[PDB]
Write a protein that binds this ligand. Sequence first.
Ligand SMILES: O=C(O)c1cccc(Cl)c1
Ligand SMILES: O=C(O)c1cccc(Cl)c1
Lengths: 265, 268
Amino acid sequence: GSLTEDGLSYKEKFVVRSYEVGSNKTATVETIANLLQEVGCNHAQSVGFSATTTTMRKLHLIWVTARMHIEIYKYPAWGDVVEIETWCQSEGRIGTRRDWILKDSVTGEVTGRATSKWVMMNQDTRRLQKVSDDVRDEYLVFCPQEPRLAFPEENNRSLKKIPKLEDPAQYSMIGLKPRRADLDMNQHVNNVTYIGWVLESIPQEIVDTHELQVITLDYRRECQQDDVVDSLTTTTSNDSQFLHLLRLSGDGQEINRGTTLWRKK
Amino acid sequence: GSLTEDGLSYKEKFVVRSYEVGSNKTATVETIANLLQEVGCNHAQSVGFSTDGFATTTTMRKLHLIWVTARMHIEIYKYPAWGDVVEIETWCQSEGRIGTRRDWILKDSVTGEVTGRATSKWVMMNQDTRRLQKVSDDVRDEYLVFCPQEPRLAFPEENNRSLKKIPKLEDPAQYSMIGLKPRRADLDMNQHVNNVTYIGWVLESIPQEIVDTHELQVITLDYRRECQQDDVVDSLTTTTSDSQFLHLLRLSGDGQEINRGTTLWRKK
Ligand SMILES: O=C(O)c1cccc(Cl)c1
Ligand SMILES: O=C(O)c1cccc(Cl)c1
């Protein structure tokens, strides 16, 4: 990959691998999510972040994902070359936003697009705080100055409020644990693993007859190495809609909530 | 990647990715194992064989016959760091009518040094029946033209590590992790649990203090029976000693064996 001409976005090419495809001989949303985070990491390194600044490292401050929204038109096939462009922007003191565009390399057409909100947090106390000038002024030089939105539409489906699923849930998958391969280098559960967990309680009937178009996922609380998660899903509707909740299998503490949209194969 | 000059092996380069690295900012053996399968698929496609993981030929598909991993053996000297470029060469080789063998060599692309090597034994099996059967001469004729004719061995040494007999762990196990289920991302396009997930499950019951002080050098895994989508696994480990462990996977219920293995760990 490489920074674009104007040094305000980053592009990278990927060849979809045999182990990255699912039931439809096409790439899973989890794989696509992995490619989002990889190109995110390449961009952060390209401009010298490591995604903390020296100011952030001094104050033990980290970015964490508050929300993730992914929309896929076409899942790329094994051996297909996909191009992903990414950029991130200030939302002032609220936090940053990273956005992605996925293209078919050969035809040049948009096959998916994604957006995510990141909030600034104390590493140790786990306490969210508004973004200060010093921090903003260090990263604003690496962001397009004009607004550039992957989801421009004046009311798109990335910024709607996700309600809490109510017991009893229609579908459930019980006793979900992360394994050591689900842990980043810092022993924090990978963000893409929550996506797997949410989809675990989607019914087989739907996997068989429908394909996933849109997923929106709120991050409330991280799941630790020795936590257990229950995955809850209820229908809310050609198209199929589902309300989702991850919560700790014991006391039922919420870690994630979300929505998915499925179109008929 | 590409078939080498003589069309009897296949070479491919990988750039190690952020999500591919573990606790020591280096690639997991699960990622390595993934890249081994990837280059194996790329080789099988480049010479016209099946891309299903089963690597079927013409006189195999109609007899409903598939290749199945009986055994896998991996040794890593160095684990590639994030952004490091790694080159993997793979080839296939006939083992009489007992089955086929696939080997790999890992190199650091920059220094050309060997940093890992692997070998695996495949057996032919009728899908629907889960049988076995030795290989026929009619099948061999159309896959021996794609193998080096003279023997070529990742682990050439006569009576080496990859060919020792692994015994059944006896209750009680020293370490256990129980109630392990596969998720949908653990299943290939055929809807079978991908054989790299077993590697993951075996290491789940490695003590944490060993993860903190040692690095994994060797793993050897026997594949007895496939775990279904709706099966549950317990992972059992016992120290046999450098640290050595004996491993067992078995259905959480009736304790039906699915895998046995050994791992060798070196001090960091
Ligand atoms: O939504 C699902 O059930 C799902 C989850 C992971 C992979 C696939 Cl193909 C489907
Ligand atoms: O069990 C282990 O040692 C293990 C398994 C997966 C990843 C890592 Cl870093 C370690």
